[PDB]
Amino acid sequence: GFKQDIATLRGDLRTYAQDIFLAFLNKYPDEKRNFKNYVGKSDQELKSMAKFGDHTEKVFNLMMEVADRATDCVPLASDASTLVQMKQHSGLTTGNFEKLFVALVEYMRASGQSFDSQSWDRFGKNLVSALSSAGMK
Numbered sequence: 860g861f862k863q864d865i866a867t868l869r870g871d872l873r874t875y876a877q878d879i880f881l882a883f884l885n886k887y888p889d890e891k892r893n894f895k896n897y898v899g900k901s902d903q904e905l906k907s908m909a910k911f912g913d914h915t916e917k918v919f920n921l922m923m924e925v926a927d928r929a930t931d932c933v934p935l936a937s938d939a940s941t942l943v944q945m946k947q948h949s950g951l952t953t954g955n956f957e958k959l960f961v962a963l964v965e966y967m968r969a970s971g972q973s974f975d976s977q978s979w980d981r982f983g984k985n986l987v988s989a990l991s992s993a994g995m996k
């Protein structure tokens with residue numbers, strides 16, 4: 860389930876983070892605009908860019924935290940508060956997040972692995988709910 864899937868991703872977090880976030884940029888090619896540094900670059904090029912690797916790690920380090928802290932795939936409001944409030948998410952909207960989570964769940968469903976994709980889908984949904992309620996557009 861959800862809790863074991865957090866353990867699984869935390870076991871190879873570097874590589875799960877880059878692959879899922881890459882799955883997101885390729886499914887929604889328009890999302891690369893938030894990351895102009897990432898335009899006209901192949902996945903293998905992106906994974907050799909210092910900020911690509913480090914920022915994607917920091918994203919998933921935090922993602923997993925919020926996941927870890929959730930009850931029944933419902934994140935804390937305080938963690939909703941943090942994401943919305945972050946300076947680096949000034950120009951973001953909940954649709955950005957939904958897409959990250961469509962890809963992630965798609966990624967898990969196409970994996971060979973027994974990820975609890977149902978959980979992550981709720982979790983994605985419930986984070987978007989909670990970003991709305993904390994004031995994300």
Ligand code: HEM
Pocket residue numbers: 890893894910913914917918919921922942947948951955956959
């Ligand atoms: C659960 C979801 C997410 C978490 C936990 C998260 C976390 C973070 C963190 C920790 C940073 C700062 C890292 C750093 O500057 O070193 C950051 C920056 C940023 N995030 Fe997010 N983020 C999330 C979702 C998103 C989504 C969906 C987008 C865009 C669609 C996005 C776009 C950005 C951008 C553009 C920055 C600043 C530029 C950059 O980091 O290279 N984030 N986020």
Ligand SMILES: Cc1ccc(C(C)C)c(O)c1
Pocket residue numbers: 880894910911912913914915918
């Ligand atoms: C927050 C965040 C997420 C992902 C990336 C790419 C490396 C994929 C960033 O630069 C920043």
